[PDB]
C-alpha cells in the first residue's frame, strides 16, 4: 500500500541550529491534514509533537512547526534544544471510501554535532574457558569517538578476513556525544590456533590505526 | 483522565499465536478508530492494522495472511490476534489511536512479544586488559556470548562502578543466538588492586552470573 519517506536518515546539528526534516507521501493522503510529526527518544514511547500537517499539541515548544503541502512535509525545530535529539517519524492517514490505511516512514535520527575525536582503540584475545567449548572470539573496542562512520577490517597473518566479523554501536553518549564501537572476530578454537598474528585496523579519515597481538605472547 | 493498558505478550513458539488485549480507560472503545503497530529491535515503526469507528478491519499485505482485529465493547477491548509466527515477529506491540486527522491521540506503553526456539542462559567470558598498552587508561570487559531470548543486562560492581561503562546492543549471531560485549575503562594503575566484576542478568532463563575480570 502507502508508505512514507522522511529527509534525511539521519543528521548533525547544534544546539540553537535550525534544523529542517521533509517528509513526502506515496499518495495524496486521504483528509488533506492527514500527518503527524513523532518524537521518539531511545527505550520510550512515541510522542506525538505535531497534527494536522500544522498543528501543534499543548505542550508542546512553539519551536516545532509542520509546513506540510500536498505530499511534501515539512518539520521545523527554529532553535533545536538538548530534548530535541531523537528520531523523528511521519506518519500519514490514506484510504478510500472503503479503505482506512496508515504507513509510517523510515525515521530520522537528528544527533548532536560534536568535533572529530579519534577512538581509543584496544583488542582482547579469546579468554581460554572460551576456547574449551571449540569457538573463538577476538573483540576489537572503539572507545569514545566521532563521528559514527569507522572501517574496521581484521587481519588474521595479515590475511583480511571477510564475514566473520559483527560490530555493534553505541547511541551517542550523554556527555561527550562520542560513540563506542566493538567488532567481533569469530572462529573455531582450531582455525584460531592455526594462526599468530590476530590484528584489528581502524581506519577513519586520513588515519588508520592498527592493534594487534600474538597469539601466546603475554 | 484517558488510559490505553495493553494486555498479553510473553514468549511464544513459532507457529504459534499471539493474542494481545488493549483495555481502555475513561472512554468507549467503539467511539474511536485503532490501530495495531509494532517495533522490532532497533528497527522503526511499522503498522499492522486498523480498525475503524464501524468495526471494519484493514489489514496490511503482510498482515493479512495471520491477523485478526477484533473488538469487545462489553471490555472495551481491542484486540490482536497473530498466527503463524516468524523470527521476524519479535517486537514490542503498541496500540494507539494514532492522530494524524484528529487531535486525540493516545498510545499504549507497548507490550513485548518474544519468538523463541530455545531458552539459553548466557555464558560469560572475560575481555582481560599490568600489560596495559593505552598510558594510565586500561580496557576490560564481559564477552556475553549464546543465549536467548532477549534481554540481558549487565552491570560493573554491582552498579557501583557506572563512569565509562559502554554496553553494546546486542547482535544475532548466524547460530541464531544472540551475543554481546560490555566494557568499561579504568585507570590502568588499579588493575592489580581494585576488583572488577560484571553482573550479567538474564531473566528469560533465571540466571544471573557474576565474573571477577583479572589481568593476563
Known amino acids: 500500500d502507502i508508505q512514507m519517506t522522511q529527509s534525511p536518515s539521519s543528521l548533525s546539528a547544534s544546539v540553537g541550529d535550525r534544523v529542517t526534516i521533509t517528509c513526502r507521501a506515496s499518495?495524496?493522503?486521504?483528509?488533506?491534514?492527514?500527518v503527524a510529526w513523532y518524537q521518539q527518544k531511545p527505550g520510550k514511547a512515541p510522542k506525538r509533537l505535531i497534527y494536522?500537517?500544522?498543528s501543534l499539541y499543548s505542550g508542546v515548544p512553539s519551536r516545532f512547526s509542520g509546513s506540510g503541502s500536498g505530499t511534501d512535509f515539512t518539520l521545523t525545530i527554529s532553535s533545536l534544544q538538548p530534548e530535541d535529539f531523537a528520531t523523528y517519524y511521519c506518519v500519514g492517514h490514506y484510504g478510500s471510501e472503503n479503505d482506512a490505511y496508515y504507513a509510517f516512514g523510515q525515521g530520522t535520527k537528528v544527533e548532536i554535532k560534536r568535533t572529530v575525536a579519534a577512538p581509543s582503540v584496544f583488542i582482547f584475545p579469546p579468554s581460554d574457558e572460551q576456547l574449551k567449548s571449540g569457538t573463538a572470539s577476538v573483540v576489537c573496542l572503539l572507545n569514545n569517538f566521532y563521528p559514527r562512520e569507522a572501517k574496521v577490517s581484521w587481519y588474521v597473518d595479515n590475511a583480511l578476513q571477510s564475514g566473520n566479523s559483527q560490530e555493534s554501536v553505541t547511541e551517542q553518549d550523554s556527555k561527550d556525544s562520542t560513540y563506542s564501537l566493538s567488532s567481533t572476530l569469530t572462529l573455531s578454537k582450531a582455525d584460531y590456533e592455526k594462526h599468530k598474528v590476530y590484528a584489528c585496523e581502524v581506519t577513519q579519515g586520513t588515519t588508520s590505526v592498527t592493534k594487534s597481538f600474538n597469539r601466546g605472547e603475554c | 483522565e484517558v488510559q490505553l493498558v495493553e494486555s498479553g505478550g510473553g514468549l511464544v513458539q513459532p507457529g504459534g499465536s499471539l493474542r494481545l488485549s488493549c483495555t481502555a480507560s475513561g472512554f468507549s472503545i467503539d467511539s474511536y478508530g485503532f490501530s495495531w503497530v509494532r517495533q522490532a529491535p532497533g528497527k522503526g515503526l511499522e503498522h499492522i492494522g486498523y480498525?475503524?469507528?464501524?468495526?471494519?478491519?484493514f489489514y496490511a499485505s503482510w498482515a493479512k495472511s495471520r491477523s485478526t482485529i477484533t473488538r469487545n465493547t462489553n471490555e472495551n477491548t481491542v484486540t490482536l490476534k497473530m498466527n503463524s509466527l516468524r523470527a521476524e515477529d519479535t517486537a514490542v506491540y503498541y496500540c494507539?489511536?494514532?492522530?494524524?486527522?484528529?487531535?486525540?491521540?493516545?498510545w499504549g506503553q507497548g507490550t513485548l512479544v518474544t519468538v523463541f526456539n530455545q531458552i539459553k542462559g548466557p555464558s560469560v567470558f572475560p575481555l582481560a586488559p599490568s600489560k596495559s598498552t593505552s598510558g594510565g587508561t586500561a580496557a576490560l570487559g564481559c564477552l556475553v556470548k549464546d543465549y536467548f531470548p532477549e534481554p540481558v543486562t549487565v552491570s560493573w560492581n554491582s552498579g557501583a562502578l557506572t563512569s565509562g561503562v559502554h554496553t553494546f546492543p546486542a547482535v544475532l549471531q548466524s547460530s541464531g543466538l544472540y551475543s554481546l560485549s560490555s566494557v568499561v575503562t579504568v585507570p590502568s594503575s588499579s588493575l592489580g588492586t581494585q576488583t572488577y566484576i560484571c553482573n550479567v542478568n538474564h531473566k528469560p532463563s533465571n540466571t544471573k552470573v557474576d565474573k571477577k575480570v583479572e589481568p593476563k
Open positions: 480498525l475503524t469507528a464501524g468495526g471494519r478491519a
Open positions: 499518495q495524496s493522503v486521504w483528509r488533506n491534514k492527514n
Open positions: 494536522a500537517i500544522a
Open positions: 494507539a489511536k494514532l492522530g494524524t486527522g484528529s487531535r486525540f491521540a493516545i
